[PDB]
Design a protein around this ligand. Structure first.
Ligand code: NAG
Ligand code: NAG
Ligand code: NAG
Lengths: 71, 501, 71, 501, 501, 71
């Protein structure tokens, strides 16, 4: 588990601020690029699970986010 | 080389007149072929070995940073360019620092700095590719003949008796013919080229431990990497940390050794032995065809043993439904056929259980000869009778289980083999067959689609998605979409459970 | 990321078989036990976002799995 | 100390009816206080030096495995137990292995293997606690008086002139009255014990660099750890891998160094300086109360300089809306006040801008004396005029921006301060009033629940939750539910953006 | 070796043509087999002896505690760890104690302490497993020939007269052909491997009394248990009590001897004889098939004696419908058959009762020879006539009961046998037939589910559940579920009552 | 946990055959006699929880059996 943002009200940089944006997104983008066929599965399941457009898109996003980071 | 003591063991029955049978020799998993009027053979691949590996990429996990240097610029003079941009092996990062009259500047604002550091990582995790023309599967074939407990697993004695042989199967020579003494000849025509997809895996050496890793996973590592036989490193900034910006000097420190992080990242990798640029794999599968036309039963013309036998020790169940016992022959007449059978009742004396050691016989003519005999008793109480009359000896045996339970176990093993081998599983124990070919084609199509859809999931993701798909199929109104949802969910759930985690 | 299960049809153990079950759930359980206040948030959002009980429970599970593993 | 040329700088105004100002001193941030008929002071905390740190737990990130031993047991019997399992500093793991007549056993099955290895840690990552009785803040106060460009940052010359001083703020001495020669005295009543939440942090020293880590994160590390002055380790299974269950000898190899994994996991940790059992961190905050009742203005008795001045260079914008310039006085009139002002036009001469250096004057009685002066001109075209008559010198200055832009920037900076400090931000620059108290109470009530609910989320998940809450509030039915969803979503989005990730 | 004087005795009337009959040979029971012409034999298993028991797990019920040591820590400094955290004979427990300035600490709170004690057991309860290769039943077969009242139970005289024999039935020799002087040969082939389910029991030795306990119960004991090879102990916290957390020293006491608690827990365990690593139990069963092809009468070529007999004592009812009497032959006419028969009246002298001692005769040629004869008189009044003419002796005998009551008792005994033996009871007295096979098959099918559903339930829970199921079935609406509810409730009630508890 | 009746088909007595009837009843009898006031609670709760004359009896019996043996 990564440390995450501290609560010390720091104005300088932390240990790794260069990767602060890509710290969590590296695994998901790499997993999606390696296995792009899942994007169809997540979209279809989200479309068939939600009765509203908001529910369908939220389902699609959650499925696209949970598969790379398995839990 | 032998099939005794193996946790994984498969039995195949050859039909009358079956000249050959297609096998899939799995790593550390023997298969025993039983046929009528022919000696039973057990053939297994011991290891897959490939030499002259070609290096492709070499990540490095322990880096060294030295020769720190930075160039500072005033807030108006634009960005700062250090003179080490033209020098390779130097990693430079542009930063922003506060500049003012206290720092020696002329104006007040955000200055520009360019800190460079010499990158030279010493310990690297080199990955190598496997050349399809250098692999050589080692396959061992054994015949159940006159053997002792002490000499059943001794390869030297079995080769001396011409009952076993270790031979190397290569793409250049996929076919090997093993010449047995009086059991005939057994020919194996394998497919070494397609047995293991070398293009799908890399041989990665991290520290003193070597692994077989996915090609896609290896290329996705975020570490400084250099191509084969080159010192040009790329992505060097991943192992380098730039500290708080400073006009006079910004400190750059390399991160700690990533060897442990690599080991944690190699959780699913298959450890292999790597020595002298040669990799040895005890896992994998090798599709092969065993031809037994020249395989002839030995000892058919021998006489029966007139003298009495004795049980040296208790028979032991092998866990596969077969029972192995050792017999000592009191007589010294010579090579004679052992009259051993498995019977339900001592009065009935009818053959009810088959013998794995087909046509057992004493080979040596000494006074006392120890013979190892393997039988497959029926479920329930049964007797193992040797001889008839006053010389008859009996050994009661109880075989726990049922045929229905055996059927369920066989179905589970078939499902596990199908999951592990995919389309190759249909080739296992298949003698031609129109059903086999169409099943293999349909499974190829379905496996391609299934891999393209859910290839990269772990067991947790597969299990959760299978449960969700099952729930959707239960509530689905249309029968067809409900059926496909249930099928996909069941397959995903089985795959998640099949990992035993 | 982690390598994951190999496709070589191995019958022995992989490099790290003892941690196979706990490899992906180690972060999730630790995160949940560290701050259980989110479990109320996920339940409330799933209840207020789904129209059926199945949709609500799927939303709750997806949120409880997507917060610990931030991506 | 002085803060000429710092990215973070706050300008407080002294209320006509208030004798003290309550301000929060943040790390690498300045607060400038300007009052009527009082000298300008800037208060800044340098660091926090906590000593006599107490070790709590020491994780191990590099282990060594040796003295390998194993023992096997027959199937359907007691599970094996190695004789070294009783010996301390030995890690043992059970397992199953195939046992048969070949291995010397008597029954075919899955025998129980038990292998133990010697555990020895090479380098360990030590964690320490900060005792609240040893925390010590270094706060420095500077008065804007007669200074040059080179001497504006030297602490020696500023103390020689009794214009600045660094002092230690400790819980046992929370107040310090800084005596200033001819400038009066300024006393500060800080809150050291409640300044930093030092009971929620550990001082982790991995390798040679030291960090300030959370307590809830430090105890979740899955590494071999020992207590203070404890040679015996616990949870040693994490740094040991049991390769393959083998009846004769199962090989155990220690994983690689976890120093790189630790550095990768310390992503948001704050690096600190640790030496001689003392931690020194320049970040954090300290709430203090400055008393300016006895702070008097120096140079109000001097006469106006009669000779001519000169600008030693082009005046420089400080970036905070103020202008810093240095003058040189060619006269020898001794201590004399500089007639410098900021006028809107050269034909008006009525001062329109405010001087940060209140009542500037020449200190030394010699000629060619250099004086640094800071002003706050109004927005638009303005002139910096020094002197009057034939010796008057003027310099045109343009201040970019507008009053509304300054208001928006101040609102954004206040929101950032509220996000970074929480309820402590309400006590910044507030001399009292019912609004500050009720605002702080409401902020405490809301923030307790906010940190209970959205406590340990990163920026990406906070942004996603904010977007989802905004979307649900837009499509909401009840006005109150929509209002609270909009508020929470906006707060989450601002917090995610405030990380600038 | 004979059924005379045993409360557990069953008779088997062999049908004509059948030369063998299946038996179960329950422990401490006796089966008497009589054919149309062949002599009556009684066969029983005296004991089941198993040697070379293998230790599996040794629990400890009496332990000692010494070398106390407590290590205290200040509050908020983490849990303490005592230096005696080593595995050998040291077990520690964490605890919290009040700390403060009185105790010499620096903070007030619930400080953590770690106290360890030396663990050393005095008496242990070793558990041993039974290897099926070493079990050997002892079966005794006796023939009802010329015996006296004193020599009927004297094995030395019976084996010297070739009328009885004790032999060992082993898995390696399950068939024995007992040799008899003039009665021929009797062959019995048994099933030692499936007789007693030795794979479901342990031989537990508590102190000096040895028991045969279930494997599941033995492994569920919450006592300090060691492995087979006298290794370090585990689960030692159960036999120790940590009195009260004290900063200076927390006393640890050892619980009293758990030998009495073990004896209380060994409620349903079967006590067995143990000596020289060999177990001997008189309980259990052993399915056998006795073959009587070569069993023949003795003394059929003798002529009936013309002298007179006298009744020595009174006939005694054995409790199984048969009466035993002794006759003293007064003549010296050598070996001659007894003209003894059972008749309903003395005006017809037609034999109506069957003689258990088939073809009785005088063996010796002495002046007075005592002969023990067993008869099965008809229900009601009957006479026991010996001879004819003026030397005829009659003995009136009254046999209480009726054939309907005999049928009820036979049904009750069969139900009890079915409950005690399960599916093995169907092979009692079965000469084959299709009804027996299908009955045993359906009984196995139902009994597997019945055991899986109501395995560990005691007679109280079985009785309550049977009553509840009967109540549900009586009030049930559908007749399909009512039938099965009534059946299961009746079976459960019978099982609860059958324990006589 | 006691041993219970063994499945060896024994025709003699087990280790403790005299207590075979009171082993599972002594604790319940002693507990019920110790505080008869609970018997009112069990009967009332069974009566108010069962809507049928048989359900009330079963509930009362189960409540009167659960309390003496707290397991
Ligand atoms: C095989 O047998 C030979 C001859 O008896 C002996 O020298 C050799 O050590 C044996 N090998 C093994 C592995 O037992
Ligand atoms: C500040 O000025 C004094 C006086 O010349 C000198 O001794 C000291 O070294 C200076 N320090 C710095 C940091 O310039
Ligand atoms: C059996 O008879 C012999 C006759 O010598 C006698 O010694 C022995 O004691 C008898 N057995 C018993 C158990 O009385």
């Amino acid at each position: 588990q990564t440390h995450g943002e501290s609560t010390l009200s720091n104005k300088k940089g932390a240990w790794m601020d260069s990767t602060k944006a890509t710290r969590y997104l590296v695994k998901t983008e790499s997993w999606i690029l390696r296995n792009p066929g899942y994007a169809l599965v997540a979209a279809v399941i989200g479309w068939m699970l939600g009765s509203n457009t908001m529910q369908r898109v939220v389902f699609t996003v959650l499925l696209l986010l949970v598969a790379p980071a398995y839990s | 080389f032998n099939c005794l003591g193996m946790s994984n063991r498969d039995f195949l029955e050859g039909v009358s007149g079956a000249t050959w049978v297609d096998l899939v020799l799995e790593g550390d998993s023997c298969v025993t072929i039983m046929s009528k009027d022919k000696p039973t053979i057990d053939v297994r691949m011991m290891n897959m070995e490939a030499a002259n590996l070609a290096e492709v990429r070499s990540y490095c996990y322990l880096a060294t940073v030295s020769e720190l240097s930075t160039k500072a610029a005033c807030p108006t003079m634009g960005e700062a360019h250090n003179d080490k941009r033209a020098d390779p092996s130097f990693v430079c990062k542009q930063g922003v620092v506060d500049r003012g009259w206290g720092n020696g500047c002329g104006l007040f604002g955000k200055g520009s700095i360019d800190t460079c550091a010499k990158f030279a990582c010493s310990t690297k995790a080199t990955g190598r590719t496997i050349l399809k023309e250098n692999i050589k599967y080692e396959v061992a074939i054994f015949v159940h003949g006159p053997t002792t407990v002490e000499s059943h697993g001794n390869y030297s004695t079995q080769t001396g008796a011409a009952q076993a042989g270790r031979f190397s199967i290569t793409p250049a020579a996929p076919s090997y013919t093993l010449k047995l003494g009086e059991y005939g000849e057994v020919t194996v025509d394998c497919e070494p080229r397609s047995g293991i997809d070398t293009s799908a895996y890399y041989v990665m050496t991290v520290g003193t431990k070597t692994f077989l890793v996915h090609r896609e996973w290896f290329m996705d590592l975020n570490l400084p990497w250099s191509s084969a036989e080159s010192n040009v490193w790329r992505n060097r900034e991943t192992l380098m940390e730039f500290e708080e910006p400073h006009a006079t000097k910004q400190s750059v420190i390399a991160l700690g050794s990533q060897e442990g992080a690599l080991h944690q990242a190699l959780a699913g990798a298959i450890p292999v032995e790597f020595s002298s640029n040669t990799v040895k794999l005890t896992s994998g599968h090798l599709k092969c065809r065993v031809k037994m036309e020249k395989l002839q039963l030995k000892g058919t013309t021998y006489g029966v043993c007139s003298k009495a036998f004795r049980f040296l020790g208790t028979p032991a169940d092998t866990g596969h439904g077969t029972v192995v016992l050792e017999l000592q022959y009191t007589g010294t007449d010579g090579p004679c056929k052992i009259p051993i059978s498995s019977v339900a009742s001592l009065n009935d004396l009818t053959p009810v259980g088959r013998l794995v050691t087909v046509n057992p016989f004493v080979s040596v003519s000494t006074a006392n000869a120890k013979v190892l005999i393997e039988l497959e008793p029926p479920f329930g109480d049964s007797y193992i009778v040797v001889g008839r009359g006053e010389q008859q000896i009996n050994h009661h045996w109880h075989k726990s289980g049922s045929s229905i339970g055996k059927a369920f176990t066989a179905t589970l093993k078939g499902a596990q083999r199908l999951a592990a081998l995919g389309d190759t599983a249909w080739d296992f124990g298949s003698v031609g067959g129109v059903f086999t070919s169409v099943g293999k084609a349909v499974h190829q199509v379905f496996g391609g689609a299934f891999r393209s859809l859910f290839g990269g999931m772990s067991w947790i993701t597969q299990g959760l998605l299978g449960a969700l798909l099952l729930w959707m199929g239960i509530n689905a109104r249309d029968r067809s979409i409900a059926f496909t949802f249930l099928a996909v969910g069941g397959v995903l759930l089985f795959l998640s459970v099949n990992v035993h985690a």
